[PDB]
Design a binder for this molecule. Structure first.
Ligand code: FES
Ligand code: FES
Ligand SMILES: [K+]
Ligand SMILES: [K+]
Lengths: 128, 126
């Protein structure tokens, strides 16, 4: 089976070009080529995190396998979910993906300006 | 067996009992507490779904957070200064009758899905 080219736009805004085998997941591509993306693929592709979140080009997105309920559950928890988002670890390379660009979106940690004040209730100590 | 109170996302209190040494994920799971989606990664420090909020005094004396826990706790939605990952917090006799809260998920917070863009341009400057 042949190899194809995939471009990644990093959170940094830097473009990484790499080559992946047809049939490999985009997570596999990130890992097997040791790309500079921090935090990506925490659950190691077992549909238990949202860290493999990627954004796809219009015409690639349109052609992706229908999203399973399982994926959708975890995709709902992706930070900054878009109408071109999928979990990269469920998306397998096809020949028609050659020279596509996917973007790695920012995490909740990148956007967070402050840590909230934690609280178990609004209840006044006097009452409690 | 010690008693823990969970304040659910609905605002409702669930009271349940856990063995010493069990994690709070353990407790949630073993007693089938209706908490949607809590502990996806089954306690392998690979999600943020076991996020819980603790009382001041309990929080302070919890086991020192590890880097592994902290990397994932950074990815929790609505991180608080009283937040930890429940799958890493084990019951002690001293925790009997404490209260924790389950914070809302990003999906609960969400009012709409955004427009996806691989990238932007301001061709006003071509
Ligand atoms: S790696 Fe965890 S869901 Fe894709
Ligand atoms: S259960 Fe996934 S990290 Fe706690
Ligand atoms: K905040
Ligand atoms: K939105």
């Amino acid at each position: 089976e042949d190899k194809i080219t995939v471009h990644f736009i990093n959170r940094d805004g830097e473009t990484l070009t790499t080559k992946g085998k047809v049939g490999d997941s985009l997570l596999d591509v990130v890992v097997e080529n040791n790309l500079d993306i921090d935090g990506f693929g925490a659950c190691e592709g077992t549909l238990a995190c949202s860290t493999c979140h990627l954004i796809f080009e219009d015409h690639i997105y349109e052609k992706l396998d229908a999203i399973t309920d399982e994926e959708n559950d975890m995709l709902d928890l992706a930070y900054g979910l878009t109408d071109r988002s999928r979990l990269g670890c469920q998306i397998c390379l096809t020949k028609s993906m050659d020279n596509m660009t996917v973007r790695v979106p920012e995490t909740v940690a990148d956007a967070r300006q402050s840590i909230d004040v934690g609280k178990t209730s609004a209840e006044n100590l006097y009452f409690q």
